[PDB]
Amino acid sequence: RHERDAFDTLFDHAPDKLNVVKKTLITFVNKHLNKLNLEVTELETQFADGVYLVLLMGLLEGYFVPLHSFFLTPDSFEQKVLNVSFAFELMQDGGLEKPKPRPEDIVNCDLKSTLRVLYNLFTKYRNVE
Amino acid sequence: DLDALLADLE
């Protein structure tokens, strides 16, 4: 039973918009970043570190969040899957509920899954600064 | 949610 979801049409009817769609997710993050006045370019690998993630939490509330203040620095994969399972932890609390894909599917630099979750955010921040 | 993704990205 191939469960049909979002990637279905996105990949089966818009392999091009899927690319531009990631770039729109780069914009929402460019917002949490534009605060410290910066610029992101790889939403996919931005979770391959969960670093830019804890930064969102701070640049949103407006505070000093050093890149090495949250969990240690991701060195290998497991360490990255962690930094994302963690963002997923303060998120499951701060809301977000249960993400669809898995902390790996995100760090996996893959777009498909990572996009289903990024959508979830664009949804909650689209109206909230 | 294709039609929607673009109906909002307009």
Swiss-Prot record, chain A:
<comment type="similarity">
    <text>Belongs to the parvin family.</text>
</comment>
<comment type="subunit">
    <text>Component of the heterotrimeric IPP (ILK-PINCH-PARVIN) complex composed of ILK, LIMS1/PINCH and PARVA; the complex binds to F-actin via the C-terminal tail of LIMS1 and the N-terminal region of PARVA, promoting F-actin filament bundling. Formation of the IPP complex is dependent on protein kinase C and precedes integrin-mediated cell adhesion and spreading. Interacts with TGFB1I1. Interacts with ARHGAP31. Interacts with the actin cytoskeleton. Interacts (via C-terminus) with TESK1 (via C-terminus); the interaction inhibits TESK1 kinase activity. Interacts with PXN/PAXILLIN (via LD motif 4).</text>
</comment>
<protein>
    <recommendedName>
        <fullName>Alpha-parvin</fullName>
    </recommendedName>
</protein>
<feature type="region of interest" description="Required for interaction with TESK1 and ILK">
    <location>
        <begin position="1"/>
        <end position="129"/>
    </location>
</feature>
<comment type="function">
    <text>Plays a role in sarcomere organization and in smooth muscle cell contraction. Required for normal development of the embryonic cardiovascular system, and for normal septation of the heart outflow tract. Plays a role in sprouting angiogenesis and is required for normal adhesion of vascular smooth muscle cells to endothelial cells during blood vessel development. Plays a role in the reorganization of the actin cytoskeleton, formation of lamellipodia and ciliogenesis. Plays a role in the establishment of cell polarity, cell adhesion, cell spreading, and directed cell migration.</text>
</comment>
<feature type="domain" description="Calponin-homology (CH) 2">
    <location>
        <begin position="19"/>
        <end position="126"/>
    </location>
</feature>
